Amino acid sequence: SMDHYKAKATRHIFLIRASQYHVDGSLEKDRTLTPLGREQAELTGLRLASLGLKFNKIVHSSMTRAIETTDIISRHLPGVCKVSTDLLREGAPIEAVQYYEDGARIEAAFRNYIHRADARQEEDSYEIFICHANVIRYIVCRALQFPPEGWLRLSLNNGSITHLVIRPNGRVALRTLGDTGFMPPDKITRS
Template sequence: MSHEPPICRRVFLMRHGHYERTGNLGDTVWGLSPLGRRQAVRVGRRLAQLVDSASGRFEGVYASPWPRATQSAEIAGREMDLDNIRIKRYLHELVPLVDPERPEFKSFPIGLEATPSEGRVFVDQQIDKIRDRFFKPPTRRSFVLLFAHGNLIRYLVARTLRLPYEAWAMMDIAHASISELRVYANGFEALISFNETGHLPPSMVTTA
C-alpha cells in the first residue's frame, strides 16, 4: 500500500513584521521597526525548517513591493540562505472591505466606514491575479513562500474557505505569522494553518 502524500501545492503566507508609521510618509515608504526585524529573523529560521522538511519543487520567495514586506522577505531569506526575492506588485496590501449591512460589522469593536464599490472591485481583481498565479491545480508537489499583508492574507483564506471577504473581520493576524493553504491536483483547496506564531516568544507577538 502506497503512503505517498497527495499531489498539492503548499502556499505559505507570511505577514510582514512590525513596522514604523513615521509621519505621513505612507505605505510605500514605511519600513520595519527594530522589533519587526527581529520578528523577520525568527520567521526566517522557522521557514528554513519548513523548507528543509518539505517535499516537492520549491517555487521561490515572492514579496509585496511595500518596504515592510520586502524587508521581511529579505531578512528571512538570509536565514534560509536565499537571496532571490521576487517582487510582485499585486501582493501589496488591500483595503478592509466593510458592508455596514452585514451582521459581522454590527458589533465590530472599531468603527469602520463602508467601502466604496470600486474598492471591492479592485480587491476582487487583485485576489484573482494572485490566485491565477499561485492557486492553479498542480501537476506535481511544490511549495511557495509569499510575504504579504494582513488583509490580503485574510482574503485569500476567505476565498479558500468559500467565505465572503468580510470574514476578514473575524480573523486576527499577527506580524511575522505563518499561514498555509494547500491546492490539490483536483482543484480542492484547504486551510492547513492560520496565524502561527510559535516561532515568536510571547513578548514579540504583535498585531498592530
C-alpha cells in the same frame, strides 16, 4: 476547495504577514520595519528554514515592509529565488473606486498565484508568499470557499505563517492560520 482546478501534485502555500513597521512613515520609503519587526522576520525565517523543505520561490508584495520582511527571511533560505509583485500590495481597510481596484487586483493575485496550476510542476511544491493581512484574509477565504464576511474574522499576527495545502483535484486544507508559536510571547504583535 477550488473548481476547474487540476494540478499535477500537491501544493503547500505559506502566506506570511509582513512584520511590525513604522505605520506613520510619511512616504512609502519611510514605512520600514521597526526593530521588533526585524526580530519578528528573523524568527519567521528561522522557523521556515527549520522545516526541512526546499521552497520553490518567494513571491512578495512590493510594499517596503514586505520587501524588508522578505530580505530577512531570504537570508535563511539561500538559493531560493525572489519575485516582487504589485498584485500582493495591501488592500484598503475593510472611496468606492479604490475598493473596486483593490478587490480586482487581489482577485487577480488569487487567480494567478493560488488557483493557477503550473503545467511544468513535476513534484509537490512549497511556495512562500510574503504580503499583508487583507490579502491573506481574501486568499484564505476564497481558497476555502468561506464567505467574504469571513475576512475580518481572521486576526493575523505580524510575521505569522498561514499554511494551505492544495491537493491536485482542488481540495484545499487549512493546516495553520496565523501561526506565531515559534515566537516568544513578548515578541508577538498585531501592529
